[PDB]
Design a protein around this ligand. Sequence first.
Ligand SMILES: [Ca+2]
Ligand SMILES: [Ca+2]
Ligand SMILES: [Ca+2]
Ligand SMILES: [Ca+2]
Ligand SMILES: [Ca+2]
Ligand SMILES: [Ca+2]
Ligand SMILES: [Ca+2]
Ligand SMILES: [Ca+2]
Ligand SMILES: [Ca+2]
Ligand SMILES: [Ca+2]
Ligand SMILES: [Ca+2]
Ligand SMILES: [Ca+2]
Lengths: 188, 188, 188, 188, 188, 188, 188, 188, 188, 188
Amino acid sequence: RKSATMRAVKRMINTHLEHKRFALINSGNTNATAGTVQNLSNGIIQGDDINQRSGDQVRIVSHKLHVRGTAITVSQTFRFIWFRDNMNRGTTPTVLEVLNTANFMSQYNPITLQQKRFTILKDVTLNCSLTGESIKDRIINLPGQLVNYNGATAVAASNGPGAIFMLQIGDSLVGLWDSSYEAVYTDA
Amino acid sequence: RKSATMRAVKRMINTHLEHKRFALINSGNTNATAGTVQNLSNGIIQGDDINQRSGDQVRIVSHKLHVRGTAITVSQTFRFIWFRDNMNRGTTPTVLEVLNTANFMSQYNPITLQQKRFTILKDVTLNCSLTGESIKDRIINLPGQLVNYNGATAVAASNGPGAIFMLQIGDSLVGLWDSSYEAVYTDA
Amino acid sequence: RKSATMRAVKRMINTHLEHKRFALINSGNTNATAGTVQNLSNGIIQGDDINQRSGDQVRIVSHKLHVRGTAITVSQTFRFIWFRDNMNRGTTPTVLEVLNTANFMSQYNPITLQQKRFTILKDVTLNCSLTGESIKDRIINLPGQLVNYNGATAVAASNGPGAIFMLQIGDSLVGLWDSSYEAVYTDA
Amino acid sequence: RKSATMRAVKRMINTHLEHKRFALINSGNTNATAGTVQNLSNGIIQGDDINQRSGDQVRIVSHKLHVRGTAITVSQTFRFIWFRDNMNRGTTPTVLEVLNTANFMSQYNPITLQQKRFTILKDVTLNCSLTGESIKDRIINLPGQLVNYNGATAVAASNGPGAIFMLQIGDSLVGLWDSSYEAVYTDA
Amino acid sequence: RKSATMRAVKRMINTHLEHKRFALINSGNTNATAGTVQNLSNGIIQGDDINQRSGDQVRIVSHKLHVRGTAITVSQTFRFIWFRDNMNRGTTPTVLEVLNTANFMSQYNPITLQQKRFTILKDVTLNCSLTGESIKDRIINLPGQLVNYNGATAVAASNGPGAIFMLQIGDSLVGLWDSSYEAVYTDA
Amino acid sequence: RKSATMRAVKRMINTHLEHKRFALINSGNTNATAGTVQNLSNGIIQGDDINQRSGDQVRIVSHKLHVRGTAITVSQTFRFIWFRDNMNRGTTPTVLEVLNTANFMSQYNPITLQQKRFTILKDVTLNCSLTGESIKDRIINLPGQLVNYNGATAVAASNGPGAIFMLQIGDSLVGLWDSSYEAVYTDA
Amino acid sequence: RKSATMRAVKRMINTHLEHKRFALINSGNTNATAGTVQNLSNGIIQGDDINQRSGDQVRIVSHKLHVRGTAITVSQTFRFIWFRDNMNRGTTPTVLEVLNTANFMSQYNPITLQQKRFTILKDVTLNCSLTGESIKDRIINLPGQLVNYNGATAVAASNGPGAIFMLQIGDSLVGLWDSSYEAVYTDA
Amino acid sequence: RKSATMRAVKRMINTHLEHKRFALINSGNTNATAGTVQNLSNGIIQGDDINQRSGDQVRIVSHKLHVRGTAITVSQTFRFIWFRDNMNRGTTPTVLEVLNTANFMSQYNPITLQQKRFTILKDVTLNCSLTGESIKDRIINLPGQLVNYNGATAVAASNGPGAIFMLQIGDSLVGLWDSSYEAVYTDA
Amino acid sequence: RKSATMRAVKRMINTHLEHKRFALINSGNTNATAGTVQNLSNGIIQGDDINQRSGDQVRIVSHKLHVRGTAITVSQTFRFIWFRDNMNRGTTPTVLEVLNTANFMSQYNPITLQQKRFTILKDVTLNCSLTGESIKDRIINLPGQLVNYNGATAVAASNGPGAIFMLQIGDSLVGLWDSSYEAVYTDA
Amino acid sequence: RKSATMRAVKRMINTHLEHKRFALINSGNTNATAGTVQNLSNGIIQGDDINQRSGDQVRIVSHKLHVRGTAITVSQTFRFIWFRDNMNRGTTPTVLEVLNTANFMSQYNPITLQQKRFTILKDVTLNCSLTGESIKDRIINLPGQLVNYNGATAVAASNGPGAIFMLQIGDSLVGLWDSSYEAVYTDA
Ligand SMILES: [Ca+2]
Ligand SMILES: [Ca+2]
Ligand SMILES: [Ca+2]
Ligand SMILES: [Ca+2]
Ligand SMILES: [Ca+2]
Ligand SMILES: [Ca+2]
Ligand SMILES: [Ca+2]
Ligand SMILES: [Ca+2]
Ligand SMILES: [Ca+2]
Ligand SMILES: [Ca+2]
Ligand SMILES: [Ca+2]
Ligand SMILES: [Ca+2]
């Protein structure tokens, strides 16, 4: 009891809040053996439109990430690591903050996972084969959390605690990857 | 029980939300035998002031419409139909969407009322007589609902589902009508 | 229980307090397209008579307002807005404080109604027709509240929080209106 | 019972609202024998940043005021009166509205405290001695309430009911005082 | 219980008492801007007939008043105030005893209503329009009370406490009014 | 029960009200075979002192009357009738209103006692004998009621319902009487 | 039980009574080795304004006293004794009535404290040092009681039982003291 | 219960305390039209005998007053007012403190009875007639209270709160009165 | 239970006993490095006045001591030790009876505290600084006990068990101290 | 229940863990108007001694900070802000991260407090006066939390989430401050 009225309260609170929505696409990037980190939630900037925000917090209700790779020239691997930076002070995290070494096979950095600097949301490896399935994709939908910002505009210095990112890393420089991303969020 | 704590929760949610307010006036229009449709909620645009909105939703707590006619030259009829367009995709609805024929006596369009494209909020007929009461008016106050928008500014293409409109239609081209309208709404 | 003895206490308190009475009349005013605001409770001044007060508070038990219009030259509209100024700092409020625009059709000012500067007690529209009923009137009786004063005499600077006023506004300069008003009040 | 679930609802409502924050500093002012009134909450203007607001209401969760005086030339007194103007119609209140006379020893104005125009939040007197402690300071943190605004920008005419101010008054023209102030507030 | 047998006793008492009846008509009087007061119950005189009385008391079971006005020359107002004089010492009350000023818009005299010299039974305003409804009427039926007399015959000096009267007052000298009146009363 | 808390409420109400006090003396009047009526409560006039009143009502908590006669020339009778005029419309009542005939032996007027115009509070007859006790006196203390006034000053026209009077009447013109009177009253 | 409804009655009685307010300031007095007694409540005189009274009683709800000393020429002591004179017959009490000897160190007069002629409300000693804190102040707020008056105006002969005073006494003639005082009081 | 053991405690306390006794006689005084006030309890002075006291308090258990008048030359009235001065500061009260005017018929002074400066214990009027009973007397015995003193000896300046007095006043200068008085009192 | 009626008995016993009062002042003494002992209760001598006693016992209900020091020439310390001599046989105790050594820092004498010859009521150290606060004071109020005497007059040989004293000791011969003292006591 | 065995488990866990201890001192620093941030927990480095750590976490059981200022040349203010950096990624935080502006009066940075980058443990302001107390100090002891490290040695890059720091800022460059600090911590 009492815990089940509580989540009827939650439902009621939510019918009262606008569920804003922000969508992004990022097509035709080369695979990277040293890795890159891509912004996801950074693109929600201060303003009055449906895919903007008031102040420096939003709360993601759910968000969805779609990754895709295509082998070019050689069969190859594409890894995508969807993560939340719980402690971001206005940066795009480096590969070496997240992975122990800059290698597509690397396990996580032991120091930064120990202190929970990051939370891994999903870690996806696609092996695209020029003698097999040369194109692969994966869509992942998850509930979200609080996201704090450190500024108004879509620049690194605006990222803050709870920022959402995706790390891409693979074993070739020559294949191509696409991603897209949507967050549904309240902003009250 | 439980249903009465629920609406104490609702009251509590509401003390936490700003009740924004938007007021509009539209004076000195000619009676129309073919009808017109006037925007009511369209005029709430994106911005930060008390009669604006964040994002593409607001929730009307209550709204109030005031209509008035004056017979000129001939005694005549003024009809006013206050309605919600539940499915608006960025237009001002035509007379023929709402009425079966473009005539002040017409019943509702059977197709669009069947599918509940519109909800009639109030349908008011004033008969102004040059040998009698030549001026009549009516004020109607009602609780409101969700209103979605399709854009930022006060243009037809910004109307969306839940948009509030008023259809005026009468039997003379020569009488004059006034209306005004206020919505009280949360915007969280 | 307990709540029903409480209002037997209230009744007992009231048999012990003098119910003072103040009556006012204001005849033969022209209709106003830009509006006027008339004092109602201001006329209760410091003194010892039955229609005066000790100190700077009284409590209105009930009060009654009577409005009347007569069409002259043209059929026309008379609007009367009986309101309490909850925050008066020693003024007669302007039309634009109460109405969004200075027009007899206007809805309320959104800012000042939001913050509850005023409480509308009754809003009455009389349409007097030179081809119909050219004379109309309405009497409204209501329970009252606390009224604070900012001075001793009957001047604007003596109005204070809870002051009672009436706003008149119409669509012609030429018709005539009358009002009268009585407050019954304790003064303990 | 029921009252303890109610304030679990309140807590839940609050985790859903951004707690915006506005900070201000005001250094190096001369002591004033006739007094001044300083704005505190006025500086929260309409906009989308973390220390701005949507619409004309915010709700202060808590706010904190820090006052400091330094005796110059003569030992002297600094009084600071932190107050809420419950009825502000778009002004900075005068000293004489708050104090019976413009004197650092004065009690409150009897008329305006009677009608509850103002609520005193804290009244602090610092005696700084050039033969003793010549520098004194006090920090006071309190829960807050609703604040209404009458406009968009940081000007007197934007103050409205619930505006927060500080009155400074002392017995010398020559000492210096500092203040700073922070409000934490929701804005839903 | 006990309270419901009590009003079966009352019913039984009443089947034992003659319900006497007195009827009166008063046609074709001019409207009066200074007002008049007309006798209603005065006309029940000592004697043995069905519309007379024994002694100086009767008890009105119910009574009924019918008022009517007709506009002549100008559209105009007729006010009729049906009242009981709780303290009559053998007079017809003046207009100024009942109304604060001798004006058809006046509120009640504050002194005499405070001490409950009079009880207003019904206050009726008819606006008769030479461009509209030029003839209006109203009938009002009410339960009655004790009526004391100060003499035997139908003269002012016979009125006493509980005497029933009607005050007529309007805004023209030229319109005509009619009234009639019936009391049903016991006389045991 | 409930009735005993009620009169604890009454006691509490009374500790909150000033018990004002008015004292009067009236010495050396001749006995009157035709009678006189003397004012008692009339002398409480509008003002701010302890033996004055605000408005037109006071409530007598208790009052006390002291009468005294002395036979001169012949042994004789002095009668004193302390009474409340429940219906006073701004007069000093005549002897014949109270007594059936103007004679010290008369019973009460049947008409005015029937309708309860007056309430006799005490009727005292002193027989002073020049061969016996030639001087007699009586003091009577009683709880009081509401007293309404019809004006501000100490004149007949200010008496109103609940006015307190004393009628003196005897069988000689030549004896002398004294009276004095005190009312304790609230005035809230 | 019953005792908790009783103080809900009290609260209800108080919402019905005007809380009048009287404020006073008394600046720049010399320290006194023989002492002075200053009036506090005396200044509430008969009249109709917010800081006046009807009759000869008021009831102080709360009152507040603020004392301040400044050492001049020599470091010195200022004593302030806030007291109620329970038996005042129209005087300002002497120092020797309150203190056993006219010395700033004296204990209370044994005779007058024994019979409870006075009630000490607060006794405050400030030691102001020209080598230290040369300025000191203290504010004290307390609930109040009944205050009787012996006259209408602000003179000694108007003080009566319950009069509020402050005795100042110190060890130098040369330092300066300030006081101010506010009473909140009902007057029903 | 508990309340009945309490007054068994009281009885036990009293068997342990000496009941001291003081007796006084005051013969052959002239009647006074302007009045006198006579001391009763003043005569108990500090010392060790049975009709003396230790310290400045005694508690009267019961006391008894005997008054007597004799008409000389003219039949006349003698009034005796036995009263306690609850607030005496070392005086014999004047006639005008007790009576509104210095007249044997006067009611009490309204100011000093309002504030309860005095409590009347018994008010006795004897009318002695040279043609009737020319000698009259009355004895009155009552329980007593605390009596405070302001000094050691039998002088006015020793009276204090609770002092017992008798006021004599009549209508002739020429008759003679006697009184005597006994107090039984504890002194622990 | 039973223990709470017991202290209702105590209260009842006390309303029956005179609370005598004795006040003393002792100004302008030099600080003492070897210490002095001052008499407090010794000054209550046999006699009949309010600040005297019957016999050789009194019971102190409460007593109050006020100490004050002023630095002269050098900043310095003043210690004051308020104590009861439980076993006094008719002396003023020496410093060395109370303190282990005659030094302002000394702890208590171990022998005499062990056997409970004395009870320390309060031990107060004031450090007065010629560069700081050069004047300090402390007031201490406490309930009291039995005090026995060994004689009638105010001499050392009259002190007895329960005698109250104050020991003063400091570190300079040159500063000045004041004290005063009041005992409230029964004497039955 | 169950919650009280739980904290008996906690106690048992703790008797099994070494409570390591690290102490630090930092003397003779100049006051800073632009502020500095000092490391506290950084100095616990990897190693095997009692004031070192294994791995990159410790858990502070309690820690204690001692701050001290001394005014030089001018009386001045020293502020010390003891805080935890919940999100440190291997830095010493700047003044502007913590304070809104680099001023000793500044409130907190709104962005970084909103996202809870820091938790303020204690904020202490010492006003040292060259005419008063020129030296002040404060010691504060608190329970602690988890501290993560980003490296082995005592350099900025080793700070991590939960790092403890102290910000010093004042209004002069010339005064001197000292601090010292001890953490008690487990390291299992
Ligand atoms: Ca936000
Ligand atoms: Ca929205
Ligand atoms: Ca009032
Ligand atoms: Ca017509
Ligand atoms: Ca807002
Ligand atoms: Ca100093
Ligand atoms: Ca009859
Ligand atoms: Ca009154
Ligand atoms: Ca009063
Ligand atoms: Ca005694
Ligand atoms: Ca004794
Ligand atoms: Ca570790």
